[PDB]
């Protein structure tokens, strides 16, 4: 196994997959590493399994048609190795806690969104559809370029948006266009 977390790639209190290399904090994992299990296996092995038993699951879909999927049992582990895949750049650090918004010349969002909070309304079975889970992600960066304006720092959300866009992309097998 691996001797660092790999989401945040520190060492420390490490939980190892039993079907691959990887290693997990606690709270990097998502869902948070099971308590039993032997073996246990990481979302990384989860996900793999489900694309090897239904290969066609890969073939090219519509955004739109994801959208309104139910988030039943496998909806669910695919938006929680989405929002992993977030995460796992060191630059969620910006996205993660919840926000405050005092500058000069810019009022805050009407509804300030956060990584942190999309992990809580995850695990606590909020969505009831993938679009509620894509459209909370989507919130974050909307709600970051709007506020820092023309301040560089704006690019920070354009940055992450791209990564949270090329994996909601691949994970869902969003059918390739120009
Ligand atoms: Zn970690
Ligand atoms: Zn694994
Ligand atoms: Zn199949």
């Given at each position: 196994?691996?001797?660092?977390?790999?989401?945040?790639?520190?060492?420390?209190?490490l939980?190892?997959?039993?079907?691959?290399?990887?290693?997990?904090?606690?709270?990097?994992?998502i869902?948070?590493?099971?308590?039993?299990?032997?073996?246990?296996?990481?979302?990384?092995?989860?996900?793999?399994?489900?694309?090897?038993?239904?290969?066609?699951?890969?073939?090219?879909?519509?955004?739109?048609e994801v959208?309104?999927?139910?988030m039943?049992?496998?909806?669910?582990?695919?938006c929680?190795?989405?929002?992993?895949?977030?995460?796992?750049?060191?630059?969620?650090?910006?996205?993660?806690?919840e926000?405050?918004?005092?500058r000069?010349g810019?009022?805050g969002?009407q509804?300030?969104?956060?990584?942190?909070?999309?992990?809580?309304?995850?695990?606590?079975?909020?969505?009831?559809?993938?679009?509620?889970f894509?459209?909370?992600?989507?919130?974050?960066?909307?709600?970051?370029?709007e506020?820092?304006?023309?301040?560089?720092?704006?690019?920070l959300?354009?940055?992450?948006?791209?990564?949270?866009?090329?994996?909601?992309?691949?994970?869902?097998?969003?059918?390739?266009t120009?």
């Amino acid at each position: 196994n691996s001797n660092i977390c790999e989401v945040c790639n520190k060492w420390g209190r490490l939980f190892c997959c039993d079907t691959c290399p990887r290693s997990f904090h606690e709270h990097c994992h998502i869902p948070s590493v099971e308590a039993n299990k032997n073996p246990w296996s990481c979302i990384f092995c989860r996900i793999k399994t489900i694309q090897e038993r239904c290969p066609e699951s890969q073939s090219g879909h519509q955004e739109s048609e994801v959208l309104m999927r139910q988030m039943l049992p496998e909806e669910q582990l695919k938006c929680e190795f989405l929002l992993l895949k977030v995460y796992c750049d060191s630059k969620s650090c910006f996205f993660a806690s919840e926000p405050y918004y005092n500058r000069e010349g810019s009022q805050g969002p009407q509804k300030p969104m956060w990584l942190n909070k999309v992990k809580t309304s995850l695990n606590e079975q909020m969505y009831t559809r993938v679009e509620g889970f894509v459209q909370d992600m989507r919130l974050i960066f909307h709600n970051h370029k709007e506020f820092y304006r023309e301040d560089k720092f704006t690019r920070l959300g354009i940055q992450v948006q791209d990564i949270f866009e090329k994996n909601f992309r691949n994970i869902f097998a969003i059918q390739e266009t120009s």
